[PDB]
């Protein structure tokens, strides 16, 4: 240990294209094991939702 230091910050929101999937005709979100996710868009009106596993 010496007097030099570097700061660590919180992580950013990481996008994942593979997470979303298709049903017969629909959009499906299946978060990985023990993971919470946020789903967003304006396809009609705005929708910001949070899914907890």
């Amino acid at each position, epitope marked *: 240990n010496r007097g030099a230091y570097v700061e660590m910050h919180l992580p950013g929101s990481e996008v994942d294209s593979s997470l979303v999937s298709l049903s017969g005709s629909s959009v499906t979100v299946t978060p990985p094991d023990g993971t919470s996710a946020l789903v967003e868009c*304006e*396809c*009609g*009106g*705005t929708k910001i939702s949070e899914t907890i596993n």
Partner: nanobody
Framework: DVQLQASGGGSVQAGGSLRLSCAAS????????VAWIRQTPGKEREFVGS????????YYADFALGRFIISRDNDINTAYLQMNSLKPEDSAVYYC??????????????????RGQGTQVTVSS
């Protein structure tokens, strides 16, 4: 001034059909999301449906699905709301709202980039 005029309402028996029109004077609908907002007396303005030219998408509320249709003819800068199967709960005044994206369509829009005069529809049981 860019003004929107709504028309096509009136008194019609339940189970019929009607066609409302929103026309813009001063600017076209070429880059405007068109949203229909309904105001029944005694309550708050309620969302009906929205249409988008950029992605050709249409949003309909729970009561509006399977009954209401929205179309746009940019040639005469007008937006049409063709709806059928009247019910007594549909008596209200309708306004048309035009917005340049800006993420204004979140649930309750409550933005009104362009506000226009509405028209009253009465439903007789």
């Amino acid at each position: 001034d860019v003004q929107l005029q709504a028309s096509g309402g009136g008194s019609v028996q339940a189970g019929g059909s009607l066609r409302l029109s929103c026309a813009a004077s001063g600017h076209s609908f070429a880059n405007y999301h068109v949203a229909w907002i309904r105001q029944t007396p005694g309550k708050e303005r309620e969302f009906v449906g929205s249409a988008s030219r950029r992605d050709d998408s249409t949003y309909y509320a729970d009561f509006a699905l399977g009954r209401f249709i929205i179309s746009r003819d940019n040639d005469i800068n007008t937006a049409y709301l063709q709806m059928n199967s009247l019910k007594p709960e549909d008596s209200a005044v309708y306004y048309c709202v035009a917005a340049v994206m800006a993420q204004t369509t979140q649930g309750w829009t409550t933005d009104y980039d362009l506000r226009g005069q509405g028209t009253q529809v009465t439903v007789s049981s």
